[PDB]
Amino acid sequence: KPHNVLLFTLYPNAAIIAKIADYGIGTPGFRAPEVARGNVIYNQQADVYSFGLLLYDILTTGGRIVKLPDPVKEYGCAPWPMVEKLIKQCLKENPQERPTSAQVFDILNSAELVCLTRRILLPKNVIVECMVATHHNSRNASIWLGCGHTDRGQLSFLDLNTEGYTSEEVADSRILCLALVHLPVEKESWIVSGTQSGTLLVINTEDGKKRHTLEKMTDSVTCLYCNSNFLLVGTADGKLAIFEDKTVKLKGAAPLKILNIGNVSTPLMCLSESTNSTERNVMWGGCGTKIFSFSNDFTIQKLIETRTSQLFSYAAFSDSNIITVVVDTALYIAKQNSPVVEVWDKKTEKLCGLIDCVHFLREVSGRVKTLCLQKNTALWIGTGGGHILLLDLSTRRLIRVIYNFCNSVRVMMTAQLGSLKNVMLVLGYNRKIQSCLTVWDINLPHEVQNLEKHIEVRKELAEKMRRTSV
Amino acid sequence: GIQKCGLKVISSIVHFPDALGAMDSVLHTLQMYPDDQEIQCLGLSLIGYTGHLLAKILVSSLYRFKDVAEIQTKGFQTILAILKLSASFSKL
Amino acid sequence: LVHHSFDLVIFHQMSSNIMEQKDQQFLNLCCKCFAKVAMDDYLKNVMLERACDQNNSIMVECLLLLGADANQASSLICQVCEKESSPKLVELLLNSGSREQDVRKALTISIGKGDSQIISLLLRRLALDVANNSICLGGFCIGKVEPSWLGPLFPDKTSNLRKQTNIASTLARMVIRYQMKSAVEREYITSLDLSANELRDIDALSQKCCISVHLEHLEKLELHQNALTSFPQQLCETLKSLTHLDLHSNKFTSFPSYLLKMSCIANLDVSRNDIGPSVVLDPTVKCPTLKQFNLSYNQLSFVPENLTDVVEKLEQLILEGNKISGICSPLRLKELKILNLSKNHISSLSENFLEACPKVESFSARMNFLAAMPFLPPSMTILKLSQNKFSCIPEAILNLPH
Ligand SMILES: Cc1ccc(C(=O)Nc2ccc(CN3CCN(C)CC3)c(C(F)(F)F)c2)cc1C#Cc1cnc2cccnn12
Structure with missing residues (x-):
């Protein structure tokens, strides 16, 4: 029972926190049903049920003390799905189905148990291409998942606090990219998407009827970005339109400036920003195999070529187009259907390093899908094979490989919730097709490292204690 | 640069009874100033009675020059005093 | 090398x-x-x-x-x-x-x-x-x-x-x-x-x-x-901006009255010290945010005086373990909810000492020399009078509504 668990500290990063005690003074509330039936001796396989009850009480923060119900429903608490599955495991009726104690500790040893916060399935299971979080820190902590399901578009809207969602079809054809813009001075917030019809549509989040249509282009919009102003636009024929944040409030707005970075044979796939504040005045974009940067004047200030990659890397993976550009001290590049990541520098405009994700993966298809960075020097590599990689920018080494939670990672955004906490949404596929949106704690790499060091220190303490006792 | 005449004033005040720590200060200066401060480091009396760094600094200051007649005899008197204070000093 | x-x-x-x-x-x-x-x-x-x-x-x-x-x-x-x-x-x-x-x-x-x-x-x-x-x-x-x-x-x-x-x-x-x-x-x-x-x-x-x-x-x-x-x-x-201040197991000798000047203090704990022989809270001090007060295991020989004018809205007044002789001044805490005078020297409570506290629910008076129980408020739910010399169940407790 919790009455038998002593606490020697409250500091999370302590070597010794909780201990067990039997004061020698089963209990009705905290006994296994097989034990309550008077059947047999307690046995090891019933202690795991008692431990599952204790885990339920810790999760619910002592709510039950003052056929078990749903912890999230009957009492208020954050989901913590990995532990809910563990609870539902070690509380099964058939004692042969309860995991053994060593197994319970082994699955309590994962940083993915501490860091996974919410795991939401989408029942419709539609192929979801894009999504954009809500930049509002209000109670409307929600996503705006865009997808394509028909000759027209599919528009979801999944609320986090509710975990329920509404779907709509308000575009004329499939959508490939999303973007949201919020003008607090005017208290206006709009969700703009890129439709494969070859147009751009605006939907005001304040009123479901306030809709507009924007200027048309010959190809399909592939990416959008908002810089915090100006609305960046990106097409598949190498076009770069700038939309004023305020001018797009009215329907049929005008693009303040339009550049043709490239041509039809080269789509513009990704636009990003520099993480360092000293370079806040440069925006980078990948038009096919050109890593171009343009200043706050919307004029190209650098134009690298990527066709040089075939001289060192394989020509097969070299002659694809850029997927993403992750701007930092060094440019990080992902190319279509390529399992290798290329590292460039802004100054020399030349290759500096390569990353062969196949090495890390085979150490356990491995196609690279999305790249994300956090300022904590951990670059999250989402591989199309359904595995996330954690690379440390100081050493460019592996931290941990996260897998067996989805089969194909599609996109990976960083976003904040209404509790001011920063999380990383990972929308992955599940083809048994099913779309699952895991919301990871942004502190996953630190958690991996700390838990490893912590379990090693405790192992050393136990070893030393066993030695001096003998 | 004023630490030289400061150590001169220190040499003036050590003659007063109950001079008591100032040993860490003059030790840091001697580690900072190798030549001039060590010439007057004979003023180092029985202070601190365990840092091996202090003895290392003393012997290294003696050896770094090792050619000035007066500092050799002064440091020898000092090390004789401190070993008379503690026999464990001989080991280190 | x-x-x-x-x-x-x-x-x-x-x-x-x-x-x-x-x-x-x-x-x-x-x-x-x-x-x-x-x-x-x-x-x-x-x-x-x-x-x-x-x-x-x-x-x-x-x-x-x-x-x-x-x-x-x-x-x-x-x-x-x-x-x-x-x-x-x-x-x-x-x-x-x-x-x-x-x-x-x-x-x-x-x-x-x-x-x-x-x-x-x-x-x-x-x-x-x-x-x-x-x-x-x-x-x-x-x-x-x-x-x-x-x-x-x-x-x-x-x-x-x-x-x-x-x-x-x-x-x-x-x-x-x-x-x-x-x-x-x-x-x-x-x-x-x-x-x-x-x-x-x-x-x-x-x-x-x-x-x-x-x-x-x-x-x-x-x-x-x-x-x-x-x-x-x-x-x-x-x-x-404090709310919880903890001072127990220290070595105190007299209650610092100015502690009750803190803008938002709401849980003061001066227990297991050697405070005594009487706490007198100064009437000029008004602490309407103090919703707990633990003076246990000190050497008090009275109830803390001026407790009604000073600690206006008190919830839990815990005076366990002290050597309190016997109450003579009636508490007037309109908002008391848990009183605790266990392990004291009380032998008889004044016949109207709790009448002006209408919200009392818990009342612990163990290990005293109590023999009679005076008029109690009808809201009293828990009543733990143990180890304390009652020859018979008092008539004032057989009429408690809840
Ligand atoms: C004074 C004291 C005496 C004895 C024990 C005690 O638990 N002994 C014990 C006896 C047997 C067993 C093994 N059996 C399990 C049952 N089983 C049927 C047979 C085998 C174990 C075990 F730890 F190994 F489990 C422990 C604990 C304390 C304590 C304490 C303490 C320290 N700080 C605080 C703060 C608040 C409260 N207590 N507290």
Whole structure:
């Protein structure tokens, strides 16, 4: 029972926190049903049920003390799905189905148990291409998942606090990219998407009827970005339109400036920003195999070529187009259907390093899908094979490989919730097709490292204690 | 640069009874100033009675020059005093 | 090579501004030699020990990145801290793994040789959890406390992030590449636990160095199991946002009345001290936010006087363990909810002492010499009168509605 668990500290990063005690003074509330039936001796396989009850009480923060119900429903608490599955495991009726104690500790040893916060399935299971979080820190902590399901578009809207969602079809054809813009001075917030019809549509989040249509282009919009102003636009024929944040409030707005970075044979796939504040005045974009940067004047200030990659890397993976550009001290590049990541520098405009994700993966298809960075020097590599990689920018080494939670990672955004906490949404596929949106704690790499060091220190303490006792 | 005449004033005040720590200060200066401060480091009396760094600094200051007649005899008197204070000093 | 003198020349040449010079081939050969001696990682541990014996934090980082057991040896951190070292070196050793017991011993060392910088560097590792917003200095036996130590522990939002240098990481990257090639060939702190640190005063917290502006947002201060004697008044007015103050198991002698001047104090605990023989709260003080008051196990010989005018809205008045003779003045706390006079010397309660407290629910009066129970409020739900000489169940308790 919790009455038998002593606490020697409250500091999370302590070597010794909780201990067990039997004061020698089963209990009705905290006994296994097989034990309550008077059947047999307690046995090891019933202690795991008692431990599952204790885990339920810790999760619910002592709510039950003052056929078990749903912890999230009957009492208020954050989901913590990995532990809910563990609870539902070690509380099964058939004692042969309860995991053994060593197994319970082994699955309590994962940083993915501490860091996974919410795991939401989408029942419709539609192929979801894009999504954009809500930049509002209000109670409307929600996503705006865009997808394509028909000759027209599919528009979801999944609320986090509710975990329920509404779907709509308000575009004329499939959508490939999303973007949201919020003008607090005017208290206006709009969700703009890129439709494969070859147009751009605006939907005001304040009123479901306030809709507009924007200027048309010959190809399909592939990416959008908002810089915090100006609305960046990106097409598949190498076009770069700038939309004023305020001018797009009215329907049929005008693009303040339009550049043709490239041509039809080269789509513009990704636009990003520099993480360092000293370079806040440069925006980078990948038009096919050109890593171009343009200043706050919307004029190209650098134009690298990527066709040089075939001289060192394989020509097969070299002659694809850029997927993403992750701007930092060094440019990080992902190319279509390529399992290798290329590292460039802004100054020399030349290759500096390569990353062969196949090495890390085979150490356990491995196609690279999305790249994300956090300022904590951990670059999250989402591989199309359904595995996330954690690379440390100081050493460019592996931290941990996260897998067996989805089969194909599609996109990976960083976003904040209404509790001011920063999380990383990972929308992955599940083809048994099913779309699952895991919301990871942004502190996953630190958690991996700390838990490893912590379990090693405790192992050393136990070893030393066993030695001096003998 | 004023630490030289400061150590001169220190040499003036050590003659007063109950001079008591100032040993860490003059030790840091001697580690900072190798030549001039060590010439007057004979003023180092029985202070601190365990840092091996202090003895290392003393012997290294003696050896770094090792050619000035007066500092050799002064440091020898000092090390004789401190070993008379503690026999464990001989080991280190 | 590493046995005789390799460190004395290698560290000297690589730290004497080896960067910012057109000696690319020179650095290449030195890194080739580095990767060559990098084998037999025991030697790397020797290099780390020698690099810490001297104050050269420029290359210790490189040794740590290549992989060096910072818990090798008087461990490393205690050695570095014993001699005069630099904050950068101890920081790099704390960031890499080092046993908690070793860090604790190093804190004791740096406490001996008083140096605020290394003390703060260590306390930022031992006793700070940014998730909870709490300092957890509980049981460290820090015989004193100085604001210059807890300074950098508080967020101090003016501070920012800046990469001072990167030469060590790049040096580490290229020696690792050469080794591989040779192988191939807001949010303030709302808690401050100082409990059980064997303190003797906290007078050093007064117009503190950058800690004064941070104490104004403290919402808990555990000071129990120390040995204090007073509470500095300047601290009482500085702590303009406390709610939970803990002072039990200290050595007090008279209740500091000005404690009830704190703007938002809501749980005061002065228990197990030697307070006595009577607490007299000054009528000029009005504390309408005090919703708990624990004066247990003191040497009180009365109920705290002027408790109605001063502590207006009190919920739990716990006076257990004191030596209270026998009540004569009626409580008037309109909002009392739990009274507790167990283990006292009471023999008879005044016939109208609880009539003017209409919200009492719990009432514990164990281990007294009680023989009769006076008129009680009808809202009393729990009533624990044990071990206290009742010849018969009183008639005043057989009529309690609930
Ligand atoms: C004074 C004391 C005496 C005895 C024990 C005690 O638990 N002994 C014990 C006896 C048997 C067993 C093994 N059996 C399990 C049952 N089983 C049927 C047979 C085998 C174990 C076990 F730990 F191994 F489990 C422990 C604990 C304390 C305590 C304490 C303490 C310290 N701080 C605090 C603060 C608040 C309260 N208590 N407290």
